């Protein structure tokens, strides 16, 4: 618990220092249902940014409960996604193992 908690806190802290105060950072621990299947999300993108378009309630990301449509993808299992090109993001997500730690963000207000 302590090890896990401080590791998750460090991830949050890393990406807070990268994105700044206008973003809420979220860490999700996701388990895929099989090696040969996916995350249960559709994506949309702009140049240098990738977003969750939809979360299927029945899929792995939906089962985590932490991520919502509109969230921006930042990092998965320590691999950077922010500012990468479309092909690299898609290929990185496809190659993920069963257990995935996803870092995302959403714009926020105080």
Curated annotation (Swiss-Prot):
Segments forming domain PDZ: 27-108
Tissue: In the brain, it is strongly expressed in the choroid plexus. Within the hippocampal formation, strongest expression was seen in the soma of CA1-4 pyramidal cells. Expressed in most neocortical regions with the strongest expression in piriform cortex and amygdaloid nuclei but also detected in the subiculum and olfactory bulb. In the cerebellum, the highest level of expression was found in Purkinje cells. Moderately expressed in the granular layer and molecular layer.
Location within or outside the cell: Cell membrane; Apical cell membrane; Postsynaptic density; Cell projection, Dendrite
Signal peptide range: none
Comment field on protein domains: The PDZ domain 2 mainly binds CAMK2A and CAMK2B. The PDZ domains 7 and 10 bind the Ad9 E4-ORF1 oncoprotein. The PDZ domain 10 binds the C-terminal PDZ-binding motif of HTR2C. The PDZ domains 10 and 13 bind PLEKHA1 and PLEKHA2. The PDZ domain 13 binds SYNGAP1. The PDZ domain 1 binds NG2. The PDZ domain 9 binds F11R. The PDZ domain 10 binds the C-terminus of CLDN1 and KIT. The PDZ domain 13 binds CXADR.
Assembly: Interacts with CLDN5, DLG4, GRIN1, SYNGAP1, CAMK2A and CAMK2B, HTR2A, HTR2B, HTR2C, PLEKHA1/TAPP1 and PLEKHA2/TAPP2. Interacts with F11R/JAM, CLDN1, NG2, CXADR, CRB1, MPP4 and PALS1. Interacts with FAT4 (via cytoplasmic domain). Interacts with DLL1.
Cited function: Member of the NMDAR signaling complex that may play a role in control of AMPAR potentiation and synaptic plasticity in excitatory synapses. Promotes clustering of HT2RC at the cell surface.
Protein name as annotated: Multiple PDZ domain protein
Name of the encoding gene: Mpdz
Residues shown, of full length: 521 to 629 of 2055
């Amino acid at each position: 618990s302590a090890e896990d908690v401080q590791q998750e806190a460090a991830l949050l802290t890393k990406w807070q220092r990268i994105m700044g105060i206008n973003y809420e950072i979220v860490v999700a621990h996701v388990s895929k249902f099989s090696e040969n299947s996916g995350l249960g999300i559709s994506l949309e993108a702009t140049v240098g940014h990738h977003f969750i378009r939809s979360v299927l309630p029945e899929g792995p990301v939906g089962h985590s409960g932490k991520l919502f449509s509109g969230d921006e993808l930042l990092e998965v299992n320590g691999i950077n996604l922010l500012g990468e090109n479309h092909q690299d993001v898609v290929n990185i997500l496809k190659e993920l193992p069963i257990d995935v730690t996803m870092v995302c963000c959403r714009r926020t207000v105080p």
